[PDB]
Amino acid sequence: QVQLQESGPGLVKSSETLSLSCTVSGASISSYYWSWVRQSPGKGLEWMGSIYYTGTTTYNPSLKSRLTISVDTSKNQFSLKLNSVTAADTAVYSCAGLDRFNWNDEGDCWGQGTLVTVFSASTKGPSVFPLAPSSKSTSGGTAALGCLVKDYFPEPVTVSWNSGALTSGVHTFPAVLQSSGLYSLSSVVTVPSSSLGTQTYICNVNHKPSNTKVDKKVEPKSC
């Protein structure tokens, strides 16, 4: 029932910083040793630092010079600010609560991991186009429809369907890296054919680096 909710702008280029926050629900702000870690496929997992509710911190020695972890007990949140960032700081960043200072050790609580890309090239938002229902390749009684998410930078984008109410049969494919250096991906969902033209289908595309959200309605092709 303990929840760790990630938020924050991520990369801020005008100050070359990376800022993330984590809000704790279902537990006291004194319940865990609040920590930040990051991970990258080739570099492995790295502990960045931890903070107690009192405000005392401990840092990975190789980050101490440019990392500050803070806690706001009033808002039940803790935060990370990494300064003078470069592309080497691209990683999946995760907040967690560790058990180092609890007598009753019941396991750590882990937030969500968020890919944050640090980049110096210009940000590019996506253009989203509907992929109208096609029955040719699906099982009897179903059809595949989707959304094409074109020419964005950097990763990631997230795609949900009908604001999260539709999850069954959703497959969001990995993005392609174009020769241009931009990304495109496609998200397809398989739905009942009998539902087409009465059930509305909308893909919700979010590209946080560009602050762009598109809700694209996907309709059957006609006329």
Residues that bind Cl ion (CB under 5 A): 58-59, 86-87, 120, 127, 136-137
Considering only 2, 9, 27, 115, the residue that binds other proteins (CB under 8 A) is 115
Binding status of residue 134 toward other proteins by CB under 8 A: yes
Q: How big, in percent rounded to 5, are the helix, strand and coil portions of the chain?
A: 5, 55, 40
CB nearer to Cl ion: give 56 or 104: 56
Q: How far is the CB of 127 from other proteins (least distance, A)?
A: 8
Place of tokens 């492995």: 44
Burial of 1 (0-12, 13-18, 19+ CB in 10 A): exposed
Q: How many residues bind other proteins (CB under 8 A)?
A: 55
Tokens of 18: 């990376």
**Residue 110 Cβ vs other proteins, minimum distance, rounded to whole Å:** 5
Burial class for 90, CB neighbours closer than 10 Å (0-12, 13-18, 19+): buried
- Which stretches of 15-168 are assigned E, i.e. beta strand? 17-25, 33-40, 44-51, 57-59, 67-72, 77-82, 91-98, 109-116, 127-134, 142-152, 158-161
| β pairing state of 3-12 and 17-25 | antiparallel
Q: Does 144 bind other proteins (CB under 8 A)?
A: yes
User: Which residues, numbered 167-186, are part of the site for other proteins (CB under 8 A)?
Assistant: 171, 173-179, 184-186
The one of other proteins, Cl ion, none whose footprint includes residue 88, by CB under 5 to 8 A per kind, is none
**DSSP conformation class of 193:** G
Site membership for other proteins, residue 160 (CB under 8 A): no
Measured distance CA(160)–CA(51) in Å, rounded: 34
Residue nearer to Cl ion on the CB measure, 75 or 176:
176
Binding site for other proteins (CB under 8 A): 35, 37, 39, 41, 44-47, 50, 58, 60-62, 92, 94, 96, 98-100, 105, 107-108, 110-113, 115, 127, 129-132, 134, 136-138, 144, 146, 148, 150, 156, 171, 173-179, 184-186, 188, 221, 223
